Design a protein around this ligand. Structure first.
Ligand SMILES: [Mg+2]
Lengths: 122, 120, 132, 101, 195, 161, 63, 99
RNA sequence: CAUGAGGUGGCAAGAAAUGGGCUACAUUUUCUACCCCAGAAACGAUAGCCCUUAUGAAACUUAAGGGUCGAAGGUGGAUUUAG
């Protein structure tokens, strides 16, 4: 049975601070250059979720302690990877996954035409 | 049956290896079934009873004891359009809903007869 | 006076440590976070269950060690690998420590569906920083 | 062992609404229609009124899971606005830091 | 009771391999690592907190297990599982003319024992309708049947398919929808004279 | 033109020997079954034996306190269902049966109780998972039980021998 | 006083030796800038204060 | 809008899975409700409050066995014993208003 | 053998004083498409009333849309606050 070949994939890693995300991106680009894949990486804009809470509980409306939620984004632009290579890369990434990051995998597979598409029946 | 247990215990005793590093720790954790299979996939334990898409989307095979014209057929088309675009339910829930609708229609037969329509 | 969780400055006799000695507004500057998980980012959910599990684990670790701990405990929720890395005092026999560690690991792995491995640290007592 | 009755009543109402919900949903779907014979709407109203209370989703009150506070509860963590703020100031949950701008 | 045992400070020689010490994700134990790392808030006349009882160093996710030699060995050991990318698929033109159908995947991560996700069951079928038998009447009929989901600039079809809690079933349903769409090119009705 | 190679579907054994079975072991390394701090470092042999025995006793008492209250391990949260979350039970589920109840009480105050129950409820003795278990576990009492199980009814001759 | 300084110096130099061994370069050419880069890569401290950074210099700057 | 556009809209509604005959604004809410999951039976609604019963039972079991050394219950028992030895014990059945 | 707990309904109704938010008190305003090279009518938000709509088992109110009527308004003098 033929193997599936993937086109592009955007496995981005988000973190609260900056140092751990930079170190993870450096480790990722090292693991990429030590194989022969040659990937790219840029810095998308960040987002900060803010919400205001009451400092006390009684008649103290003049004092409010707000809280933010700083997070960053660093996506990896991978190119030319088959199914087995992508699975091995995902395995090696998950084996060294931190305890405070996210990971979404969006791999697009390649295919010419299915069986019933030219002259199908119902 | 006890001889097989004794033989398995002897095998486990003669084939034991003390843990040297964290690699054996993670190997034992994976073989025991604790972490997720690392090919992290949203299909393990979520096959939805192996029902295909022709039973989820196309609900034409559930329109037998219902007329083709009138408000009854309109309500049937409405509930079919509603269930066909429901990714949270499955085929069993739709079958149960159709059965409950059929039971509700058969329980109140005089209402359907006096509703200016003939329940076929 | 916004009396927060900071240590009050009065008489020089309280052996305050280094964790809760700083002000609550120096967390992202001169401190850190005990817990860390994906629930604290945008687009994720199920944070209430994580907070409940964290507070239950903290209460259990404080109850099972009535004085055997020093400060607090650092949480590392690595998807499905919890690690209660903390410290230990030099006051009891190592047999009791091994027994408690094994019992806690077994309870965690058989209740919260997650294996846990500890990393004890050899300290004489509480990590004191100021005698104020 | 429980200490408060309000949270118990709230969780019992939530459980009874979770158990009895498909019938109410079907009745509400049969109610709101364009034409439809009026006898069906009448019998649906009779069936939904014959059932007692302590099951309606309107009777569900969102409160805290530790303090049972009806007002000032974030839906993200489902708790009061005091214990969460204290645990955030202690330096436990990541990300939730004081707004320094 | 009380005892005194020498840690790894007096055991490490000069040519000891680092991944052989901490091969797994170690949370950095200062009692065994003889690295004098110091950080924190110092004072005017004094020194900051060292490594003993340093909770800040334990909070920081250290990457000592990501040794460069270990990364090199892991990359050299995984070369057998890697297949081979053909030279005919390097260019985007031939890769798009030979494989125009694209099926995006969805694989998220959680923080608990459950890995269920209702948002990870949607596929994005991005097929460029430019390498098929698109004539004039068939193309006009397909455009009028789609509406705005088919871009008239890049000629990329975008259909959000997420009506079943599976991915292969979503792909099969998308294939069936494309089949019904292409059936309109060969099976007409009787309302084309009043166009 | 485009050559599509075959697929490779590997499990855990492949990545195991590809990653874990490649990094060598440290020279002055310690067994990872214990700990790493100097206060719990396996120096001599008696300390290692004591630590291993304490770990085994802790695991045993944990299993005991878990299986003692079956009403605390009946809520399954994980959808894939980890197989290490099913507690073991020692009480029979059907007391109206005789041979099945005796077998559940013996294998799946044990063998003697099962024999007494089978004699009281008039249950036939089988040749599998009965005579062998009585001869192994329960050497005069075990031999007497085996002889009684063999002479109770005409079962298999090879198993009785 | 001098004994603790000598202990800190010997700990610093054995740590530098171990770091130069684990990185893969010669310990003589392992300058302090490379030490700081390796510490920042292995210990990614994500804070805003510049004083709470993991450093490993000569004890003349710490004390 | 003409007959051709109407037939195209009908074909699109039959393909995507809508209703052939035209409906009204009051009959689409039930359809879009059946096309989703109700709020009274979703993910985070009926499990709003965690099951504190099993946790309380486990805490009481560990307290009776002597594992979870909770100082709050010990202080409560101390205060109860002090109030009993002082002269204010717990009222029993048959002492108060009647006797 | 309650000052405890569960079931049905009622509680936001008016002689009257008082603080805060919004609205306008016309050619600086109002409307029409382009948000100011335009035109026109010598102005706007609220009682109350009728119909209808999203959720709600049933609007005695806080939501919105439609319709004749649409209440002091025509730039505030005894004292004050911020930039
Ligand atoms: Mg203040």
């Amino acid at each position: 049975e033929p193997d599936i070949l993937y086109k592009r994939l955007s496995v981005l890693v988000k973190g609260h601070d900056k140092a751990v995300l930079d170190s993870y991106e450096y480790f990722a680009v090292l693991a990429a250059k030590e194989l022969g894949i040659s990937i790219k990486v840029h810095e998308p804009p960040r987002k900060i979720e803010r919400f205001t809470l009451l400092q006390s509980v009684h008649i103290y409306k003049k004092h409010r302690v707000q809280y933010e939620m700083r997070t960053l984004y660093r996506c990896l632009e991978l190119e030319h990877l088959t199914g087995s290579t992508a699975d091995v890369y995902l395995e090696y990434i998950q084996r060294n996954l931190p305890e405070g990051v996210a990971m979404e995998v969006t791999k697009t597979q390649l295919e010419q035409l299915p069986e019933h598409i030219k002259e199908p029946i119902w | 049956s006890l001889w097989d247990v004794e033989f398995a215990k002897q095998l486990a005793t003669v084939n034991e290896q003390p843990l040297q590093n964290g690699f054996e720790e993670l190997i034992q954790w994976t073989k025991e079934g604790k972490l997720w299979e690392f090919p992290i996939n949203n299909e393990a334990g979520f096959d939805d009873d192996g029902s295909e898409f022709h039973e989820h989307i196309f609900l034409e095979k559930h329109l037998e004891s219902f007329p083709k014209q009138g408000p009854i057929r309109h309500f049937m088309e409405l509930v079919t359009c509603g269930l066909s675009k429901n990714p949270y339910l499955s085929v069993k829930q739709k079958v149960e809903h159709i059965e409950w609708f059929r039971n509700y229609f058969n329980e109140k037969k005089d209402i359907l007869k006096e509703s200016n329509i003939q329940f076929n | 006076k916004n009396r927060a969780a900071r240590v009050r400055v009065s008489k020089g006799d309280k052996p305050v440590t280094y964790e809760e000695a700083h002000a609550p507004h120096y967390i992202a500057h001169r401190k850190g976070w005990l817990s860390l998980h994906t629930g604290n980012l945008d687009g994720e959910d199920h944070a209430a269950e994580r907070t409940v599990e964290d507070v239950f684990l903290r209460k259990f670790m404080w109850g099972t060690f009535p004085g055997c701990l020093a400060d607090q405990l650092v949480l590392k929720r690595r998807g499905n690998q919890l690690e209660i890395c903390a410290v230990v005092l030099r006051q009891l026999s190592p047999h009791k420590y091994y027994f408690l560690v094994g019992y806690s690991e077994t309870l965690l792995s058989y209740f919260y569906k997650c294996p846990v491995r500890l990393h004890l640290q050899t300290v004489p007592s509480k990590v004191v920083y100021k005698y104020l | 062992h429980y200490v408060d009755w309000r949270m118990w009543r709230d969780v019992k109402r939530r459980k009874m609404a979770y158990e009895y919900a498909d019938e109410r949903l079907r009745i509400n779907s049969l109610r709101k229609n364009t034409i439809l014979p009026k006898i069906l709407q009448d019998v649906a109203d009779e069936e939904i009124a014959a059932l007692p209370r302590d099951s309606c989703p309107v009777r569900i009150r969102n409160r805290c899971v530790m303090t049972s506070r009806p007002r000032g509860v974030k839906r993200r963590w489902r708790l009061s606005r005091i214990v969460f703020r204290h645990l955030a100031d202690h330096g436990q949950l990541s990300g939730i830091q004081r707004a320094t701008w | 009771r009380r005892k005194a045992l020498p840690p790894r400070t007096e055991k490490m020689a000069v040519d000891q391999d680092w991944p052989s010490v901490y091969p797994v994700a170690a949370p950095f134990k200062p009692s065994a690592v003889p690295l004098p790392v110091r950080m924190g808030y110092p004072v005017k006349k004094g020194v900051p907190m060292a490594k003993e009882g340093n909770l800040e160093l334990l909070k920081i996710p250290n990457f000592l297990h990501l040794t460069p030699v270990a990364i090199k060995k892991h990359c050299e050991a995984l070369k057998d599982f890697c297949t081979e990318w053909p030279a005919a698929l390097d260019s985007d033109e031939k890769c798009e003319k030979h494989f125009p159908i694209e099926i995006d995947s969805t694989d998220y991560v959680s923080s608990g024992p459950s890995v269920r996700n209702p948002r990870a069951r949607v596929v994005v079928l991005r097929v460029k309708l430019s390498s098929l038998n698109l004539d004039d009447h068939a193309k006009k009929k397909l455009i009028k049947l789609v509406g705005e989901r088919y871009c008239k600039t890049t000629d990329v079809l975008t259909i959000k398919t997420d009506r079943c809690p599976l991915r292969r079933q979503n792909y099969d349903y998308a294939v069936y929808l494309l089949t019904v769409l292409y059936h309109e090119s060969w099976n007409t009705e009787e309302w084309e004279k009043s166009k | 033109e485009v050559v599509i190679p075959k697929k490779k579907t590997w499990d855990k054994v492949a990545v195991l020997q590809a990653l874990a079975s490649t990094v060598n072991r440290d020279t002055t390394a310690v067994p990872y079954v214990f700990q790493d701090d100097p206060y719990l470092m396996p120096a001599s042999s008696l300390e290692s034996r004591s630590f291993l025995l304490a770990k085994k006793s802790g695991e045993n008492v944990a299993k005991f306190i878990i299986n003692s209250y079956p009403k605390y391990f009946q809520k399954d949260i994980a959808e894939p269902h980890i197989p290490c979350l099913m507690p073991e039970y020692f009480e029979p589920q059907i007391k109206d049966i005789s041979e099945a109840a005796l077998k559940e009480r013996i294998e799946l105050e044990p063998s003697t109780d099962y024999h007494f129950q089978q004699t009281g409820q008039s249950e036939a003795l089988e040749e599998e998972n009965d005579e062998t278990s009585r001869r192994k576990a329960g050497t005069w009492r075990a031999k007497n039980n085996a002889e009684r199980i063999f002479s109770l009814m005409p079962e298999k001759n090879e198993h009785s021998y | 006083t001098e004994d603790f300084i000598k202990k800190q110096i010997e700990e610093f130099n054995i740590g530098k030796r171990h770091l130069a061994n684990m990185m893969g370069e010669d310990p003589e050419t392992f300058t302090q800038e490379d030490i700081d880069r390796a510490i920042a890569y292995l210990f990614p401290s994500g804070l805003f204060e510049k004083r709470a950074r993991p450093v490993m210099k000569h004890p003349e700057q710490i004390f | 809008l003409s007959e051709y556009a109407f037939r195209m809209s009908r074909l699109s509604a039959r393909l995507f899975g809508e209703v052939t005959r035209p409906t009204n604004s009051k009959s689409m809410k039930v359809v879009k409700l059946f096309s989703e999951l109700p709020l009274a039976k979703k993910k985070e609604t009926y499990d709003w409050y965690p099951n504190h019963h099993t946790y309380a039972e486990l805490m009481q079991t560990l307290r009776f066995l002597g594992l979870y050394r909770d100082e709050h219950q010990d202080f409560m028992d101390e205060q109860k014993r002090l109030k009993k030895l002082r002269g204010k014990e717990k009222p029993k059945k048959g002492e108060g208003k009647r006797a």
